[PDB]
């Protein structure tokens, strides 16, 4: 995130970090067993890190759960990034609490001009 | 772990959904119906490498997944996001059967 601000710790409880030795992508928890992310973040093995704020320091709310299934959209196009969506099944269900929580899927598409919140541990 | 360039602490950004006409004009020949632009045409505020897969949440609903862009926070090159309101049935059916 360029030009952002630091989120209040655990105020984005659906944000997860995808980890293969180090952070490489984000995702969103949509039920206790499933994270939605981008298909171009695919790796054959992924550890999902929930409850994170500082991804370099153990702060006490983390849950580290390895993926059991990783399903990219069948019509993902690696050249154009069309259909860039992926689902990750946790090998055990996350414990939902005040710092690890789900985000609702949309009930309709958002109008142009709608204010949104974007988050991540990407380059600043 | 954040490695050599990523921040340690989770970063946040408020940003508006952009019109499809602005999205297509920013990225001629590259925008499908499964993509939406979110951010600022003047640049300066945007998602970037390491953010992909993460959320764009509007009025409590996941509407976008960080996908791609030209550079980061560049003028007339807003972020391009997977349009989640195209995929609720794919998501729900995949979850239901797996
Ligand atoms: Ca931590």
Curated annotation (Swiss-Prot), chain B:
Record's subcellular location: Secreted, Extracellular space
Annotated positions for site Required for specificity: 46
Active-site residues annotated for this sequence: 52
| Intrachain disulfide bonds | 23-37, 48-72
Q: Which domain of life is it from?
A: Eukaryota
Family membership noted in the UniProt record: Belongs to the peptidase S1 family.
Know the name of this protein? Trypsin
């Amino acid at each position: 995130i360029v030009g952002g601000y630091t989120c209040a710790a655990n105020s984005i409880p659906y944000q997860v970090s995808l980890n293969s030795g180090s952070h490489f992508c984000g995702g969103s928890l949509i039920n206790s067993q499933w994270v939605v992310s981008a298909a171009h973040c695919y790796k054959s093995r992924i550890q999902v890190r929930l409850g994170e704020h500082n991804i370099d320091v153990l702060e006490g709310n983390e849950q580290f759960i390895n993926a059991a299934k990783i399903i990219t959209h069948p019509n993902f196009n690696g050249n154009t990034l069309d259909n860039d969506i992926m689902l990750i099944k946790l090998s055990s269900p996350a414990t939902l609490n005040s710092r690890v929580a789900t985000v609702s899927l949309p009930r309709s598409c958002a109008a142009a001009g709608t204010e949104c919140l974007i988050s991540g541990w990407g380059n600043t | 772990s954040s490695g050599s360039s990523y921040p340690s602490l989770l970063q946040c950004l408020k940003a508006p959904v952009l019109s499809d006409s602005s999205c297509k004009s920013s990225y001629p020949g590259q925008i499908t119906g499964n993509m939406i632009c979110v951010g600022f045409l003047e640049g300066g505020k945007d998602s970037c490498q390491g953010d992909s897969g993460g959320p764009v949440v509007c009025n409590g609903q996941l509407q976008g997944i960080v996908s791609w862009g030209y550079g980061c926070a560049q003028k007339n090159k807003p972020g391009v996001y997977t349009k989640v309101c195209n995929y609720v049935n794919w998501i729900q059916q995949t979850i239901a059967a797996n």
